Amino acid sequence: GPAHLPYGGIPTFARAPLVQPDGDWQADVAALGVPFDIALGFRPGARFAPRALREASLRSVPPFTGLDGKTRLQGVTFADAGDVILPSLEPQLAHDRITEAARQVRGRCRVPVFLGGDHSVSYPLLRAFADVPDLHVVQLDAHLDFTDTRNDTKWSNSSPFRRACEALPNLVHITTVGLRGLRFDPEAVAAARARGHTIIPMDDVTADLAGVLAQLPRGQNVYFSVDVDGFDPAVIPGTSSPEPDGLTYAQGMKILAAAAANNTVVGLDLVELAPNLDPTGRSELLMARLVMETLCEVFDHVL
Amino acid sequence: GPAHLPYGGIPTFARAPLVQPDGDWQADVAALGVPFDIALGFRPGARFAPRALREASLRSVPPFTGLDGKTRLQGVTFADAGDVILPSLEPQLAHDRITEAARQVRGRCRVPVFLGGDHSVSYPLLRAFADVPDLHVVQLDAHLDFTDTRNDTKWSNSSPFRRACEALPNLVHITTVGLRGLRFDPEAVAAARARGHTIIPMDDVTADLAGVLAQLPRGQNVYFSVDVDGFDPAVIPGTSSPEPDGLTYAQGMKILAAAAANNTVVGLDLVELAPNLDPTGRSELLMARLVMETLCEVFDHVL
Amino acid sequence: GPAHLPYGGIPTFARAPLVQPDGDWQADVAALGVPFDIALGFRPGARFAPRALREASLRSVPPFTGLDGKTRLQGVTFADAGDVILPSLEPQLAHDRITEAARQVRGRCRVPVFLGGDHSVSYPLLRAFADVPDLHVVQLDAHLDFTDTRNDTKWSNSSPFRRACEALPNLVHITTVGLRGLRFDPEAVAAARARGHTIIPMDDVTADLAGVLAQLPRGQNVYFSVDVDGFDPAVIPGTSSPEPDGLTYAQGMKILAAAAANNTVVGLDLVELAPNLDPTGRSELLMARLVMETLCEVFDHVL
Amino acid sequence: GPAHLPYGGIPTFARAPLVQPDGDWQADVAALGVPFDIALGFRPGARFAPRALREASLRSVPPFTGLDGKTRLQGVTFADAGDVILPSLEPQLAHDRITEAARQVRGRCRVPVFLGGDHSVSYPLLRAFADVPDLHVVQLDAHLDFTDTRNDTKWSNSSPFRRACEALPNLVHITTVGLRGLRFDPEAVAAARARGHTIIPMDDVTADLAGVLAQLPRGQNVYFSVDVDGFDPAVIPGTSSPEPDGLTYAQGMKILAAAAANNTVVGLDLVELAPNLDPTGRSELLMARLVMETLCEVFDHVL
Amino acid sequence: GPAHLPYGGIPTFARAPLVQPDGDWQADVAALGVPFDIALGFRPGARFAPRALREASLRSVPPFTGLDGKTRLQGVTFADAGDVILPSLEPQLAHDRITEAARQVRGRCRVPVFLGGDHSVSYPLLRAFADVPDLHVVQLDAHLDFTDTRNDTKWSNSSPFRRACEALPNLVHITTVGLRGLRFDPEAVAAARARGHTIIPMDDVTADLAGVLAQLPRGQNVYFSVDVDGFDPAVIPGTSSPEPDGLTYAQGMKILAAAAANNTVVGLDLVELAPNLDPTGRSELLMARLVMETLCEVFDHVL
Amino acid sequence: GPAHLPYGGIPTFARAPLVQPDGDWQADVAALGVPFDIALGFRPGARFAPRALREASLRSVPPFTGLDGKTRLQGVTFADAGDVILPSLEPQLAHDRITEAARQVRGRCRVPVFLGGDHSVSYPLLRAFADVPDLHVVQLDAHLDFTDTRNDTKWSNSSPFRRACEALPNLVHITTVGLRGLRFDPEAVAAARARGHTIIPMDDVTADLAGVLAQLPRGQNVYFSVDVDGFDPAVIPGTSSPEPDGLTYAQGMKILAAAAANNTVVGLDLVELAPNLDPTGRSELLMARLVMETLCEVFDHVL
Numbered sequence A, B, C, D, E, F: 001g002p003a004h005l006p007y008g009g010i011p012t013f014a015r016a017p018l019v020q021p022d023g024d025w026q027a028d029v030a031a032l033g034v035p036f037d038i039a040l041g042f043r044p045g046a047r048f049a050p051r052a053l054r055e056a057s058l059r060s061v062p063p064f065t066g067l068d069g070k071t072r073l074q075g076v077t078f079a080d081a082g083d084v085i086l087p088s089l090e091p092q093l094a095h096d097r098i099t100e101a102a103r104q105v106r107g108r109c110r111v112p113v114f115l116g117g118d119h120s121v122s123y124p125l126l127r128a129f130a131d132v133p134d135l136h137v138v139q140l141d142a143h144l145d146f147t148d149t150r151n152d153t154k155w156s157n158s159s160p161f162r163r164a165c166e167a168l169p170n171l172v173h174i175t176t177v178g179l180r181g182l183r184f185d186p187e188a189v190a191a192a193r194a195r196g197h198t199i200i201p202m203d204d205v206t207a208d209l210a211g212v213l214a215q216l217p218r219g220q221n222v223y224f225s226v227d228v229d230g231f232d233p234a235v236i237p238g239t240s241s242p243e244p245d246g247l248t249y250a251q252g253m254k255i256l257a258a259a260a261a262n263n264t265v266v267g268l269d270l271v272e273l274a275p276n277l278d279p280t281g282r283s284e285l286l287m288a289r290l291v292m293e294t295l296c297e298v299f300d301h302v303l
């Protein structure tokens, strides 16, 4: 039968059927949105990212047959579990609802995809992976986000991984790639290193990408956390706090593809996208493709 | 339980459940989108209107308890039948698919709501009502849209009602309110008058609204066609061809309310909304409300 | 000597000298900003309003000599106390800081001007007026904002006056003008009415403005709360939740002028402006003028 | 044969043939642009107005057959003399080039149409009408623009008519309609009244439009000067310094229409349009139409 | 003699004299616009590209004297034949109108420059080159555009070269450079390879540009087709369907420069530019320069 | 205790205290804005750059502790001297106002930072350095700006350094890096070479950046002039006249860092930023950071 053009149809992620987090369904991949952006400290807009990503994903409906004739995501079913129902304010309640929804979705799919939302959502999201032994996180970001307190709060988008580690003893390591900028929280850097976390500055990527890939985990259970500001602002300008000289789409994708080829991917989140800050719409289009391309890599080599 | 905020959840019209035009369902109201805008002769964008209206409708989820404490649309069921699957180009095929979908939706609901799309969609939509005796159309528009041929085509957005009339002998009358502008197709005006159609210039609405309401049909089968450019550009700037000094939201709504109170409404379409032309977003927010408020009025007088 | 054009100089409200809330200063009028917008339920952006209003106020630097040759605000001194230092999240802490800064500013000026920020800021702002006998609030708004709980929180922008009344036994009456829309919280409306509050729908303003002015308070201590969405979206589109058919600038100004002529004005807040939602910039330009014109009226009838 | 749609073809005013100011041609109406905006004191952008107006005029190509079947501008020839070649800075030189071009275009048409550009262009433009006996100017504007010196200059957009009067003893009277705002130059107002100029505040138009029309000249040589900020900012937001509660399109047109039918119109300029400040594009669309409708009125009452 | 600044004068390509496609003129280079965008399957806007390109070209008026002091395009004459008069809808009629205009312009100049318009215009454009022996096409694009049918039509922007080949046996070869993305039409790829077409993925350009240049045709009659989406979205965001990691301006220009110095260039089109999708305006400014620089290279190697 | 988030507080550069140019203060670094943009020859907007840069600088408040734990600008004091009070038009008066303000600021700080404004401001700015022996200028720009006359004026943004040199024989040498484009003023290029100025095209940076750095001055009094269009438009699109293939932020910074490491930096200006042309806001965010990072380098190598 005829198929909808991108501007047609209800926008669900990858045009997947809609389901409830605690419903009776099962799928290889399931998306869950978290339209929460009140924890960021600059320009809001990320609450609109889940919807923008769903809309942009209509340009990337699986499966995909590449130029070389190979087809990826063949036989991979999808589901869109909608969005976590968030309260106004009440960060603690929002966190609990996010964790509960993430748990339910995780228990019904193989690889859950979480659409943020500012980076603070990664904390309650990760609480749903408490039973993953030696859980590792691979984070693309211009910022470390391992701060204890910022602007008198423990729940800002600058503390998700610090909060996650103190709540999850199974989260044994984090590899962050793309760090750059004039300012870094010394207490956060010290705390991350003290825990053996791997910090890879964007300088490393530029000088030797081959080496960066060489620093990625091997044979581990990995959770992907992609902060769109890890990418160069010229490529992805739609984000609150841009920092120059970031990852090209290709570099960020190469890092994700490599990690997904040598590890067991247990989930992925895409955060800090701000559609309202990029009127060209390329930010949401490229990031929706990023999620889909990452999934291609994952399922094209799973154990 | 908790409810989503406007920015949360999958955007279906009025958050109604998604169904297939020819699926096994029944509801009081059913929405059907027609993301077609290649027939307009100026600024494109109406193809994105159905999606924009669905998103905006999340701010107007029924039922409604007003300031006076009374509730409207209580117990009235809704369904979103998605969008007509349109081809690229191929206007004739597009028309056939639009009529087929509209027919299927019509047979399954009491009042169908069509989301355009440029005004040319009203022609194939009306074909789905060829069985309605003495069908009257109440049209809000700055333009008459009764032209025979324009820029070498019979299918432009300036010809929907002319096409509809020649194909539907049961379409016995059209009442158009809000006409204004420097240019009018003399052949179209003459043709409309000859068929006994009622033409109500905006100047008459400004001069005496009560008089205009008295010119509306009474005890007839009515199809509403709302071209957003009938409203003043200051109120609704998101449209291809704006004309100064149009209807305020209140005036247009009073006309729809009056007609809905004195006739049997068989359907309604909302066309020419161009979200891309109004970065403030008020155009879609207000027009989504207009559709919902019109339904409140329609169901307040169900015989 | 030469004076800056609007685009020159540091933007302080009315180009007034900068001071600290608890510093050693005194002035007739003092402005204080509250860049808080995490309590609204739709489109963010009001956190940028204080800055936008300051920039726009450079087009309205006092005193003003009108067409008739008469001068207003002559000799009236101004000061800009900057903004309340807000934390991230932590609504309760934010409230405490807002109340403290407001108290300090209030103690050093005759009429304090508060620039929001979403409407939730009116609650902590009003707490600074606990010592004002029989405090009356005159609120311009499309919404009532007298809700107890909304989306699982007590601190949303829909509850500021409910929170204020429970924290301030001296807040004996509220007059709200401009209400309109398909939905209202029935408990909020009934509670407000049962408390003796005056609700004036926009319909009444349109029907008989004189009658509305006659309903305003007289010989009372009055605090002005101006929610920009009380104004018609065509005039002021830059706001989160617009509702059609609102106050023209002239109508809103007549209401404020009337109240200022017959009462002791103790303060005023300007909330819900979202500069990011109006690329024409007219929203902040017109609202900055409203504040300045309101002050002209206040000081013209001060007792 | 076939005609271009608005988005097709080279944009010349009213789609008229292109000519040189000092070329060998003759026409009833001739357009001349003056992309000069370095004299305004706030938001630039008017330098692009001539081009925006030409593009917008493609929606208003003459002649016009209205709803009544009557045609206007039938047989009336048009020409586009392009723009004055302006230097960078060098206001004195720009003025001389403007006057020379205006003189040349004036000598080759019956009614010249000048597209600004900020209002300062009206001065060198008026210098080309030194031989018109008892010249009268009908100015639509929110401001008076009769200031002697502003920000240390004699050539700002606040001084065009003051400069014109001192250079043209034949300019015997000016009628300005639409004045509003909190500030007016007391010296400028006094100077205007001393010369017998007529000042009609927007309040007068609102209170009694009939009384306003009665103050317009009769049987005089009239030059129209339309500053788009005379119109309400909700209608025409694309302008540097908007002032609330202005003329609706209809009111401004009624004033121009009355004056056009009772006098010998020798010219007209349209200034202060800032396309860049109105992403909806309604400002240029409506103002291009304003010019064409004014012309319809002019040639509809030729002696 | 004084010359207009970019914002002055009537916008004709390269500020060249305006002429009719069938008029009495002759020039080395002639531009023809094709404001047709109803064939694309995503975001419209390309219909405004011809006009945007003309305006942007005022920043690149020939001749050009570089930093080395050498002058290019010296003595080369230009002309702007306006735009093809397109009907509404009626793709077949549009195609015929396009081919006829292309033929007329082709016979009055040496190198015709066609401004699109979506890519589907290349088909009717190429039909005007049926008499060119062993015609080779050098295509810059992220997409192949050799698809047979898409969304029930043979005339989408994904089929221009497929339609051109089955209609022009003299079209013996196509070299496409810049291909990338997750999805490629296997049937289209197979059909292209079966005809011996050269497919050069962006990866090859990145890996070895010298190798890519060595693959370009030599001593052949070449038609250049430049789809702006061949360039990286960071550089040229103004396009309907962007794909990450594309050609830099320099890389695309190097390809065109090399092909221009070793072949007989018979024409060039610039398609898919969507000015409405890039509010920074760099897309049209850079692409206008691309056409002009390509022309510099072309006439520096004419035999 | 707590500190403002970027959206909070009065926007002064680096959140530094506000002072008067001739006031009684002293600071290591002092900022002065020059909101002048009437000299550029294309798209206006730079007049708003000083304000945009100040706002953006709130994201770069000193001192800075990098990822390595080292802190820069520790103890370095800052001040914001506001903006030069500019007249409307009257370029010569503007120039004198600028030179005097710059001299006053220079005598109260070690390193003055000047915020433009179009590039023409560099001329009056440099006059404030008439007392510096063997003054060298390091200019990042896509254009040379050594033109004598352009569009009939001596004061355009294409002549700042030409004017500066003839007024300042002590300005012995200029090193311009980043030059590119199709057109260059041969007269300007010759005059610069004759004075021995070093011209470094962007191609040289791309080929061998190390070789470019080796060409920078050593042990000299250096004034930095950064024209944002020197950077690639993909990175910094907010500028009047962009040119493809420019400096990455990293490259521009490397050039500035190199010169600051072994020269006595006497001042720096940042010109041609046009915030209105980049709705993503990255242009001002990155350029504010550039200024701050340059200062970090400067004070890391003080003699």
Ligand SMILES: NCCCCCCN
Binding pocket: A119, A143, A144, A145, A146, A147, A157, A158, A185, A188, A227, A229, A241, A272
């Ligand atoms: N790590 C401190 C700053 C992190 C900000 C988070 C995401 N933008």
Ligand SMILES: NCCCCCCN
Binding pocket: B119, B143, B144, B145, B146, B147, B157, B158, B185, B188, B227, B229, B241, B272
């Ligand atoms: N009736 C001729 C013009 C109609 C245009 C249709 C809708 N914009």
Ligand SMILES: NCCCCCCN
Binding pocket: C119, C143, C144, C145, C146, C147, C157, C158, C185, C188, C227, C229, C241, C272
């Ligand atoms: N009174 C309930 C809704 C109020 C919203 C507040 C302001 N927008």
Ligand SMILES: NCCCCCCN
Binding pocket: D119, D143, D144, D145, D146, D147, D157, D158, D185, D188, D227, D229, D241, D272
């Ligand atoms: N009459 C003083 C102000 C005039 C400004 C001119 C036009 N905006």
Ligand SMILES: NCCCCCCN
Binding pocket: E119, E143, E144, E145, E146, E147, E157, E158, E159, E185, E188, E227, E229, E241, E272
């Ligand atoms: N080749 C199939 C897709 C082509 C789209 C055309 C231009 N964007």
Ligand SMILES: NCCCCCCN
Binding pocket: F119, F143, F144, F145, F146, F147, F157, F158, F159, F185, F188, F227, F229, F241, F272
């Ligand atoms: N050097 C001639 C052009 C310079 C323009 C200046 C800055 N944009």
Ligand SMILES: [Mn+2]
Binding pocket: A119, A141, A142, A143, A145, A157, A227, A272
């Ligand atoms: Mn992060």
Ligand SMILES: [Mn+2]
Binding pocket: A141, A142, A143, A227, A229, A230, A272
């Ligand atoms: Mn980050």
Ligand SMILES: [Mn+2]
Binding pocket: B141, B142, B143, B227, B229, B230, B272
């Ligand atoms: Mn219409």
Ligand SMILES: [Mn+2]
Binding pocket: B119, B141, B142, B143, B145, B157, B227, B272
């Ligand atoms: Mn219509």
Ligand SMILES: [Mn+2]
Binding pocket: C119, C141, C142, C143, C145, C157, C227, C272
């Ligand atoms: Mn409110």
Ligand SMILES: [Mn+2]
Binding pocket: C141, C142, C143, C227, C229, C230, C272
């Ligand atoms: Mn409100």
Ligand SMILES: [Mn+2]
Binding pocket: D141, D142, D143, D227, D229, D230, D272
């Ligand atoms: Mn004015």
Ligand SMILES: [Mn+2]
Binding pocket: D119, D141, D142, D143, D145, D157, D227, D272
């Ligand atoms: Mn004026």
Ligand SMILES: [Mn+2]
Binding pocket: E141, E142, E143, E227, E229, E230, E272
């Ligand atoms: Mn393509």
Ligand SMILES: [Mn+2]
Binding pocket: E119, E141, E142, E143, E145, E157, E227, E272
């Ligand atoms: Mn293509």
